[PDB]
C-alpha cells in the first residue's frame, strides 16, 4: 500500500536490472517516466466470467498437449474459489520464455505411444546436449575471432 | 497467513500460466487492485513497461 | 563380393520370423525350433545374435500357434477349451497388431535391429508368460484347465498378473455360466463331462 | 472466434443460459473435449453414407434413403467443406427415429467390419 | 555354472514350498524356460583393429561397444563366458590401442552389471522363488528397459555419425552409476539368498545406506515401493 | 469471389438443413453453422457427439425440473 | 497369402450356399438363412470397400491387411461352418432351428460367434414361431 | 568431451586448448585442495574439514565449495533432523556427533 507513483517506481526498480551509474539513474528515471505516461494515457482514455476465461486457458493448455498442467491450473483455481489480479495474470500469461523441454497392462495396453514417448524423450535429451555443445563451440569460435578487449 | 498463501498460490499459478509475475510485482498488483485499479489497465501498464524495460536493458547493455 | 544381408533385409526376414513364416536368409531350423541364419551369407556376430534373440519370439509364436490350431479342431475339448483357444487368438491378434505397427515403422524407414530389440522386449515377456501358461495347462480340460490357470494367477508380476487375470475371467465366464445354470436351472449341459456335478442316469 | 469461445456460445445457445450460468457444464465439456482433440480412426465418408443408408432402411424410409443419396451427391458436387466425415458422423450420432417405436437389433464390429485405427 | 546352482536352489525351494503347502499344487514354469539359453537376457555364448587408423579404430570400437552395451558381442570386442555367478568378463582384441582399451575397460563394468541384472531377473522370476522376488525382477526389468532405451537412442545418434568415444563416455556416466547400483543389489540378494522379509530387510537397509546420493536414493525408493507392494 | 463464397455457403447450409430434417436429427437453427464450423476444425467428432448428447440430456433435465 | 485366402474360400462357399438355399425348393427356413447370410456378406463387402479405399490411398500393406482382416476372417469361418452343417444335415424347419441352437451353444466360447449366432437364430426362427 | 568434439572437428592449437583449459585448471585445483583437507576425516571431522575450506576469498572457489558443502551437509542435516526429530540413531559407522550408549 503506497502512492501510485511510489509503488510504480518500486516495481520499475524491481524490474530494472540496472558503464556508469549515471546510465542506471537515467534508465530508472526513463522507466518511471514511461510508467507515469502510460498510466496517465490510460486514465485519460478512461465482460465475461473470469471462470469462463480460466476455462478458456485450461482448454487451451489441454489442447496444447498440457492436460496435466491444465488439471493443475483447474485445481489451483478451485482452491482460489483477487479476480482482477487473476485477469492481469491472464493477460500476462504466455509472456514467459517458451518451453520446448519441461493394475498393469491388459495385454492390449501394449502401446507404441508409451515407448514412442520414451524414445522421443531420450532423443530430446541427446539432441539438446549436442545443441548446447554446438552453441558453446560457436561462441568460442567467435571469441577467438574477436579482439578480446571489448 | 491467508494473504501469504494466496500470494504464493498466485506465484505458482502465474509461473504455470507462462506470465512470470514475481513476489513484489504480485504484491504491488494486489495493493493496486485493493486500491481500486482496473486489472486490464494494470496489465497494459505491465506489458508496456516490460517492452520498455527490454529495450532499455538492451540499450544499457550495449552502453556498458 | 560375399553376400552380407542388409539391415533392411534382416529386418524383413525377422519380421517374417515374428509373423511365424521364415525369411529369405534366416530359416526355421526345426531341429531346434528356432530360426537360424545360413552361413553361406556373411553377417556380423551381433546381427546373428540379435537374430537369435528375436527368433526366440518366433519360437514362442509358433508354439502358441500349434497349440491353438490343435485344440481348435477337437469338439471334444469342450467349451472351456474353446474359450482358452479364443483368449489365445485374442492375445495373438494383439501381437500381430504390434507386428503391424513395427511393419509400418519399417516402411517409414524405407528403425534399426537394436531399436527393434528394445521394442520387442515387452512382446517377448508377454509371449513367454503365455507359452508357459499354455504348457502348464496342456493336457488338461475342464477343471484341470481352470486349476492350471488359477495356479498361474499366483504370479507376483503385475503385467503378467493382469494378463493372466483377464484370461482367467474370460475362461471362467463359461464355467460360471454352467454353474449358474447348475445353480439356476438345476440342469446340466454337460455332454463333455467337464462340470463338477455328475448326473448318473 | 476461438474454438473455446465457440463451444461456450454453443453451450449458451443449448442451455438458453448466460455464459457464467453453465460454468460447471462448460467445465465438464472442456474436460470432455480436451480428452481427445484428434480423431483416432481414418476418415472416409463412403462408410458414413453406407451406415446412414442402412439406418434409414432399418427405419423403413428407403425413399428417404434415396433422397439422402441424392443430397449427398449434391453436397459433394458443390463441395465447399473439407472435413465432411466429421459432420456426417455428428449428424449420424444425433439422428433420432420419430417415425417408429424405439428398437434395434445389435450390429457387430468384429463379425461386421470395423474401422482400422489410424 | 551359475545355472546349475540356481536350479538346485529352485528345487530345494520347491520341495520346501510343497512341504509347507501340505501337498497343494504349486505353479511351475515349463522347463524350456530354464532349459533354453537363447531366451536368457545376458549374453549368448571383422578386420583386426590394430590395422585401422586411430579414428577408424575408435569407430570400430564404438560399434563393438554399442553391441556390447546390450549384451551382444562386437567384432573386435568379445565376451568371456562366466564361471559361477559373476559379472560378465570380456575379451578385448589385443591389437587395439592401449588407450582405447583402457577407455573401454572403464565402460565395461556397465555391461557386467547388465549381465548380472539379466541373470537376476531370469532366476528371480520363477514361481517358486516367491512374489517378492518376482516383483523385484519385474522392477529390474523396467530399469533395464530404460537403460536399453537410452542405448537405443545413442545408437540412433551414432547412425547419424554424430557420436564418438569421449561423447559416449560423457553420455554414459549416469548409466554407469545406475548399473553399478543394480549389480551390487543383485549380487547381494543372490549371495544372501534372501526371500520374503529377508529381501525386504535388505532393501530397506540399502535404501538407508544409499541416502547419500539422490539418484541412488530415488532409484532404491522406487524399487522398494514396487517390491514391497506384494508383501504389503 | 466473396459472392461465390456466399452462394456456396448458402447452398451448403440449405443442403445440411435438408439432411438434418430428413434424418430427423432434432437439431434447431442455431446449430446452423457454428457447431459444424467447430467440427470443421478437425475436432474429434465422437467426443463432439458425446458432449452434445450430454448437453441435450442436461437441457432436457433442466426443462423437466422447470416444468 | 495362404493364410488370408481361406477368407475368400469361405466367401465362395457362403455365396454358393446363399444362392442354393434361397431357391424355393430348399424351404423358407433356408431362404431366410440365405437372406441373413446375404446381409452379413454385404457387411463384408463394405469392409472390402474400405480396404480398397485404403489401397487406393496407398495406406495398406501385407501385415496391415492381415491384422485388419482377422475379425472378418473369424466371422466368415464361423458362417461357413454353419452353412456347411446346415447343408450336410439338409435341415429344414425345426431341424434347422435345432442345428442353429446347438451350434450357438457350442460357439458359446467366443463372444463374436455368440452374437452372430444369436442374430441368426432370432432371424431364422421368426417364421417358425 | 566438448574439447574432444572440437579436436575432431579439426580432423585448433594447443594454446587455444590451454586457454580453453584455464577455467578447468582453476576448478580442479580448488577441488584437489578441498579433497586434501577433507581426507582422513569422518562425520564432524569431515564436515569441519570441508567447512574450513569455505574461508577462501576467491569467489569461483567459494561458490564451488559452498555447493559442495551444502551437498555434504544434506546427509549430516538429515541425520541431525532424525536425531533432532526421531531422537534416534542409524549410526553404524559412528559419524554422528550424538552417541547413544546401549
Coordinates of C-alpha atoms in Angstrom, one line a residue, chain H:
Chain H
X1 CA 34.0 -34.2 -24.4
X2 CA 33.4 -30.7 -25.7
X3 CA 37.1 -30.4 -26.3
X4 CA 37.2 -33.8 -27.9
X5 CA 34.5 -32.8 -30.3
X6 CA 36.3 -29.6 -31.1
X7 CA 39.5 -31.6 -31.7
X8 CA 37.7 -34.0 -34.0
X9 CA 36.4 -31.0 -35.9
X10 CA 40.0 -30.3 -36.8
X11 CA 40.4 -33.8 -38.2
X12 CA 42.7 -25.9 -33.3
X13 CA 46.0 -25.3 -31.5
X14 CA 47.4 -26.4 -28.2
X15 CA 47.3 -22.8 -26.8
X16 CA 43.6 -22.4 -27.5
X17 CA 43.1 -25.6 -25.6
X18 CA 45.4 -24.2 -22.9
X19 CA 43.2 -21.1 -23.0
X20 CA 40.1 -23.3 -23.0
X21 CA 41.6 -25.3 -20.1
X22 CA 42.4 -22.3 -17.9
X23 CA 39.0 -22.5 -16.2
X24 CA 39.3 -26.2 -15.8
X25 CA 42.6 -25.7 -14.2
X26 CA 41.1 -23.5 -11.5
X27 CA 38.2 -25.8 -10.9
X28 CA 40.4 -28.9 -10.5
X29 CA 42.9 -27.0 -8.3
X30 CA 40.2 -26.0 -6.0
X31 CA 38.7 -29.5 -5.9
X32 CA 42.1 -31.1 -5.2
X33 CA 42.7 -28.6 -2.3
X34 CA 39.3 -29.3 -0.9
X35 CA 39.9 -33.1 -1.2
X36 CA 43.3 -32.9 0.6
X37 CA 41.9 -31.1 3.6
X38 CA 38.9 -33.4 3.9
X39 CA 40.9 -36.6 3.7
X40 CA 41.2 -38.9 6.7
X41 CA 38.1 -37.5 8.4
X42 CA 34.6 -38.6 9.0
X43 CA 31.4 -37.2 10.5
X44 CA 32.0 -33.9 12.2
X45 CA 35.7 -34.2 11.4
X46 CA 34.9 -34.4 7.7
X47 CA 32.3 -31.6 8.0
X48 CA 34.8 -29.3 9.8
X49 CA 37.5 -30.1 7.3
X50 CA 35.2 -29.0 4.4
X51 CA 33.9 -26.0 6.4
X52 CA 37.5 -24.8 6.8
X53 CA 37.9 -24.5 3.0
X54 CA 34.9 -22.3 2.7
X55 CA 37.0 -19.4 4.2
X56 CA 38.7 -19.0 0.8
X57 CA 38.3 -15.5 -0.7
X58 CA 38.3 -16.4 -4.4
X59 CA 34.6 -16.3 -5.4
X60 CA 34.7 -19.1 -8.0
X61 CA 36.3 -21.4 -5.5
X62 CA 33.9 -20.0 -2.8
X63 CA 30.8 -20.8 -4.8
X64 CA 32.1 -24.3 -5.8
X65 CA 32.9 -25.1 -2.2
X66 CA 29.6 -23.8 -0.9
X67 CA 27.7 -26.0 -3.3
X68 CA 29.9 -29.0 -2.2
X69 CA 29.3 -28.1 1.4
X70 CA 25.6 -27.9 1.0
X71 CA 25.7 -31.3 -0.7
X72 CA 27.8 -32.8 2.0
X73 CA 25.7 -31.3 4.8
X74 CA 22.5 -32.6 3.4
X75 CA 23.3 -36.1 4.8
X76 CA 24.6 -34.6 8.0
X77 CA 21.5 -32.4 8.2
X78 CA 19.2 -35.4 7.7
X79 CA 21.0 -37.3 10.5
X80 CA 20.6 -34.3 12.7
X81 CA 16.9 -33.9 11.8
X82 CA 16.4 -37.6 12.7
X83 CA 18.4 -37.1 15.8
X84 CA 16.5 -33.8 16.3
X85 CA 13.2 -35.3 15.2
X86 CA 13.3 -39.0 15.9
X87 CA 15.7 -38.8 18.8
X88 CA 17.2 -42.0 17.3
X89 CA 20.3 -43.0 15.5
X90 CA 21.1 -45.1 12.4
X91 CA 24.8 -44.6 13.2
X92 CA 26.5 -47.9 12.4
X93 CA 29.6 -46.1 11.1
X94 CA 29.7 -43.7 14.1
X95 CA 29.8 -40.4 12.2
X96 CA 27.0 -38.6 14.1
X97 CA 28.0 -36.3 16.9
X98 CA 25.4 -37.8 19.2
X99 CA 26.5 -41.1 20.8
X100 CA 23.8 -43.4 22.0
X101 CA 25.1 -45.9 24.5
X102 CA 23.0 -49.1 24.6

